[PDB]
Subunit: 243 residues, 2 copies
């Protein structure tokens, strides 16, 4: 099912209002440090389905060791359908509740930055789920997407695929430049033995260049370890109650 | 796991039925250089539901040859009266496959396959009478055993020397024989495709020679798994998904 236009119209209005609070530069001392000295805790989130039955997961990993120091998985009911450009309106209230639970249970494990599976400013109205989560919690957030959201002239055509071929080693990047001339994100080759890139964008309180480089440092495999461990735990949490 | 009194009975039945195995070619297409006259190849599968030991789906497919297109398919949810015991695979699944073959005979007798590829060994077996022999003897159809892992019987071992021989298999179609302590050839390891490295283990079920079984298995491989066994797998899983409503 798809929401009526009157509902999407309210949602667009809310995205435009909250967009004013996005901060697209570094605001934390570790972010300006050549090796991120002072960064100790990286968060990742996930919301998986068995709809209605879904699992929202939050993990916190140590940095740079990338070991899980916190995990929480909660069975939730998301009735909102998926509409591209409105991902936050189906999951962000449950992700906020997970952050609030962490604050009440293990406040010293509050992450210094959260990797979100979905875009930040690379978005139809420049305000993706990673921005939305960052503004509601005021945590620094990075958007990490597996496919390219085709907005502002960006398209996964042959020219885009040629640039992907030029990504040869882990850490290699190319910028996603919209028709406006704005840089919306970066395509990142996240490790040496993978060819399909990550699409990284700013959520909140971080610069793009820092966001890219940290994402790279969190990649044992293609998927950054915080997002990957949240994915694993949400489906393994499902296996425990179902089956 | 069944008590030894039940396994003893099963060994006795394997010994009785083994007498009817025919380990040579008895069909004209088999002795043809290009299997001309072969038109229908069967594949079977029995897949179990995740979390339910007892409920399983038995599937029979028939493919055209050489085009390898599905021309018949049938699935049935079944109740399993025995757990998996290595060496007794037939006593878990053969009753359901026989009933599937009989249903084909009653509904589309002109689509009866000329040979069946079975996911499991034939004579490469603890007592020389694996599920592929067992199916072949109960239906009198020619059958080929195709296994993914090496059943370690009569001196066969998936040791370092075995892994070395797998390395010497260079392209699709390359083989080496599986030799028992007695010196007899129990089956072949076959590299079934160019873009795979893990071999198939091929053995005679019934009414076919090993060399013919190996060459036919190879010709049914679009991917690593021979297309009749692969389409039966796909169908069982798709049928399970639908019975669950998903
Ligand atoms: Mn995820
Ligand atoms: Mn997933
Ligand atoms: Mn199978
Ligand atoms: Mn399987």
């Amino acid at each position: 099912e798809r929401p009526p236009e009157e509902t999407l119209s309210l949602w667009k209005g809310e995205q435009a209002r909250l967009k004013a609070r996005v901060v697209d530069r570094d605001t934390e001392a570790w972010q300006r440090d050549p090796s991120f000295s002072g960064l100790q805790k990286v968060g990742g989130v996930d919301v998986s389905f068995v709809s209605v039955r879904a699992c929202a997961s939050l993990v916190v990993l140590s940095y740079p060791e990338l070991k899980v120091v916190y995990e929480d998985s909660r069975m939730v009911g998301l009735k909102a359908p998926y509409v591209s450009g409105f991902l936050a309106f189906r999951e962000v209230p449950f992700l906020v509740e997970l952050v609030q639970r962490l604050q009440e249970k293990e406040p010293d494990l509050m992450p210094q930055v959260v990797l979100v599976d979905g875009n930040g400013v690379l978005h139809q109205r420049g305000f993706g789920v990673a921005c939305h989560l960052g503004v509601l919690t005021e945590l620094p957030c990075i958007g990490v997407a597996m496919k390219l959201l085709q907005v502002d002239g960006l398209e996964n055509n042959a020219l885009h695929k040629e640039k992907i071929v030029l990504l040869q080693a882990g850490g290699d990047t190319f910028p996603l430049i919209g028709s406006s001339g704005t840089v919306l994100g970066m395509a990142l080759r996240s490790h040496d033995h993978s060819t399909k890139p990550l699409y990284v964008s700013v959520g909140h309180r971080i610069s793009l260049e820092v966001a890219v480089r940290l994402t790279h440092h969190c990649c044992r495999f293609r998927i950054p370890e915080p997002i990957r461990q949240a994915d694993i735990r949400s489906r393994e949490y499902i296996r425990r109650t179902l089956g």
